[PDB]
């Protein structure tokens, strides 16, 4: 149970947390070791890991897969790769959280599920909000400068952590526009 | 007292091994017995990390020549170094003269990537190497998609690279 | 043997599994009030006909309650039967004869529905008003520290004796803030 | 790691054999000064290898550090060894192998690691000419 969940959440699918695309991660739900008491905690934790697999999968698919070549901003193109590049850097504290978790399990192997749910409560709201913001960009084949507006309007929200988080990626995409503008003017 | 008898959620270095052994045997039955992965862990943690540290040098190790879900974890952290191998294999030359110059210019980055290993990890956890060498292995990997491992030479390379 | 011995020794399994159990103890009125009262009642010829029960002890119920109050829903005990969380009837502890017990767990379940609804309100934001968004943020800010208190008491079931009168008076300044 | 540090021994035996065998008068006046300016680089490699031993005695030396230290001295000895093999094998002597060193300055010049060694070796070998 201990290293297995950290294995699953990192972006490599677990054998207990079976990777599907329509149910994400799902606990196996057939052991006589699990119960409605602990299941709900496992599902709540599994939300963040499913989103993390999708994040790393999208970032990997669109960063360093061509010589930047024709290319459209819904598939290829400098803006979308810049989005992936910023998306990896905002996800750095989640990696730090998993690394910290294994060290605590090394210090004492008797920690409960309440500890990991308790530490990971702060990510618990942050991942679902940004998930749909990237989902609308992916589905509609938003091309060109409209990508900046699409993430920009949902960084005009009423949630502070989502505001800081989306604002970082938007700074990254401004950077590539500014690097091209710094010659042409 | 006797105790309130710690749950499977609490105890996690002996019951963890028990559960690992049990789900491994269950999967082996559900296939038939043609899967066969013993040992919930083994060799150790540090040994496998040093093995992978030697994979990033681009040469032989103890598990490659260059739960049971360790292989899924191991593939992306070995494939970082199998990408280092394909740039040193693109390099011997100090005909075409500018191709020798370009090939020697690659080595000034390869030595950085070879220096980052065995200075930043003096053996850390394996997940740490997986996270650290994504922001480092990607920059090397773009150049392996670029290089042939034929390759242009002369004016063709001087104009393709521009 | 191999895994079953580790189960039988180190882990409980007697309320979660629909597997009945009996526990041997010294008994002697201070902790055998339930069986003594049962024998009194049976000698009066009710006419027996008891309820189905699976025999859970006291300290398991503590961890289930702390889980309910932290904000995680749908557990084995305090499962909804009308939409409101209500305690299971397979419970007899070897003293209190489950008449004090059903009343105290009933009040605690009445507490659990109120935080169940609020965590449901936060749940329906995971799947433009801007004031609801700023409302669940403060609700969340209560919930993280509150859940920490609950989980700390859960640790002290792992490492001294804990009972009902300890958790009620410890959660007094939170049941004030819940109203 | 032992296998990638080992070429410098093969490219040290060649250089020390060229200095003893080519110091007589059947190979001529230019080959004397050529081996004489090779002789200082043999002494230089020995000066490096002694400091590394003095470090090794306190348990402080590792094979990785050995590789990093000998990477500057590998290139120099490699150029010397390949040239010495070619000059002995074809029996080149006099000014026909003072043309060869002028050519070897050009031969690898793309990173110009080998030009600066060979220009030095040419000037030293052409001093008695």
Swiss-Prot record, chain A:
Name the job this protein performs.
Component of the gamma-tubulin ring complex (gTuRC) which mediates microtubule nucleation. The gTuRC regulates the minus-end nucleation of alpha-beta tubulin heterodimers that grow into microtubule protafilaments, a critical step in centrosome duplication and spindle formation.
Q: Which organism is it from?
A: Homo sapiens
Record-given protein name: Gamma-tubulin complex component 4
Point out the gene that encodes the protein.
TUBGCP4
Q: What disease involvement is noted?
A: Microcephaly and chorioretinopathy, autosomal recessive, 3: A disorder characterized by congenital microcephaly and chorioretinal dysplasia associated with poor vision and nystagmus. Variable ocular anomalies include microphthalmia, retinal folding, retinal detachment, optic nerve hypoplasia, absence of retinal vessels, round areas of chorioretinal atrophy, and attenuated electroretinogram. Most patients have mild developmental delay and mild learning difficulties.
Q: Where in the cell is it found?
A: Cytoplasm, Cytoskeleton, Microtubule organizing center, Centrosome
Instruction: Give expression by tissue.
Output: Ubiquitously expressed.
Q: Which residues of the full protein are shown?
A: 1 to 191 of 667
What family is this protein classified in?
Answer: Belongs to the TUBGCP family.
Swiss-Prot record, chain B:
Its job:
Component of the gamma-tubulin ring complex (gTuRC) which mediates microtubule nucleation. The gTuRC regulates the minus-end nucleation of alpha-beta tubulin heterodimers that grow into microtubule protafilaments, a critical step in centrosome duplication and spindle formation.
Q: Which family does it belong to?
A: Belongs to the TUBGCP family.
Summarize the disease involvement recorded for this protein. Answer: Microcephaly and chorioretinopathy, autosomal recessive, 1: A syndrome characterized by microcephaly, cognitive impairment, underdeveloped retina and choroid, and epilepsy in some patients. The more anterior parts of the retina, near the periphery and pars plana, have a grayish hue and diminutive vasculature similar to retinopathy of prematurity. Visual impairment becomes evident during the first year of life.
According to UniProt, the name of this protein is Gamma-tubulin complex component 6
Q: Which residues form a coiled coil?
A: none
As recorded in Swiss-Prot or TrEMBL, the protein's gene is named TUBGCP6
User: Parent protein range shown?
Assistant: 305 to 506 of 1819
Q: Where in the cell is it found?
A: Cytoplasm, Cytoskeleton, Microtubule organizing center, Centrosome
From Swiss-Prot, chain C:
Protein's UniProt name: Gamma-tubulin complex component 5
- Record localization: Cytoplasm, Cytoskeleton, Microtubule organizing center, Centrosome
Cystine pairs: none
**According to its UniProt record, in which tissues is this protein expressed?**
Widely expressed, with highest levels in heart and skeletal muscle and moderate levels in brain.
Q: How does it assemble?
A: Component of the gamma-tubulin ring complex (gTuRC) consisting of TUBGCP2, TUBGCP3, TUBGCP4, TUBGCP5 and TUBGCP6 and gamma-tubulin TUBG1 or TUBG2. TUBGCP2, TUBGCP3, TUBGCP4, TUBGCP5 and TUBGCP6 assemble in a 5:5:2:1:1 stoichiometry; each is associated with a gamma-tubulin, thereby arranging 14 gamma-tubulins in a helical manner. Gamma-tubulin at the first position is blocked by TUBGCP3 at the last position, allowing 13 protafilaments to grow into a microtubule.
| Origin species | Homo sapiens
Instruction: Determine the domain of life of the protein's source.
Output: Eukaryota
Q: What is the lineage of its organism?
A: Eukaryota, Metazoa, Chordata, Craniata, Vertebrata
* Role: Component of the gamma-tubulin ring complex (gTuRC) which mediates microtubule nucleation. The gTuRC regulates the minus-end nucleation of alpha-beta tubulin heterodimers that grow into microtubule protafilaments, a critical step in centrosome duplication and spindle formation.
Tell me its family.
Belongs to the TUBGCP family.
UniProtKB/Swiss-Prot annotation, chain D:
Tissues and organs where the protein is expressed, per its UniProt entry: Ubiquitously expressed.
Superkingdom assignment: Eukaryota
**Could you say which disease the record links this protein to?**
Cortical dysplasia, complex, with other brain malformations 15: An autosomal recessive disorder characterized by global developmental delay, variably impaired intellectual development, speech delay, facial dysmorphism, microcephaly, and varying degrees of cortical malformations including pachygyria, thin corpus callosum and subcortical band heterotopia. Most patients have generalized seizures.
Assembly state and interactors?
A: Component of the gamma-tubulin ring complex (gTuRC) consisting of TUBGCP2, TUBGCP3, TUBGCP4, TUBGCP5 and TUBGCP6 and gamma-tubulin TUBG1 or TUBG2. TUBGCP2, TUBGCP3, TUBGCP4, TUBGCP5 and TUBGCP6 assemble in a 5:5:2:1:1 stoichiometry; each is associated with a gamma-tubulin, thereby arranging 14 gamma-tubulins in a helical manner. Gamma-tubulin at the first position is blocked by TUBGCP3 at the last position, allowing 13 protafilaments to grow into a microtubule.
Name of protein: Gamma-tubulin complex component 2
Q: Which gene encodes it?
A: TUBGCP2
The text of the family note is: Belongs to the TUBGCP family.
The places in or outside the cell where this protein is found are: Cytoplasm, Cytoskeleton, Microtubule organizing center, Centrosome
Q: What is the effect of changing residue 75 to C?
A: In CDCBM15; uncertain significance
* Protein's organism: Homo sapiens
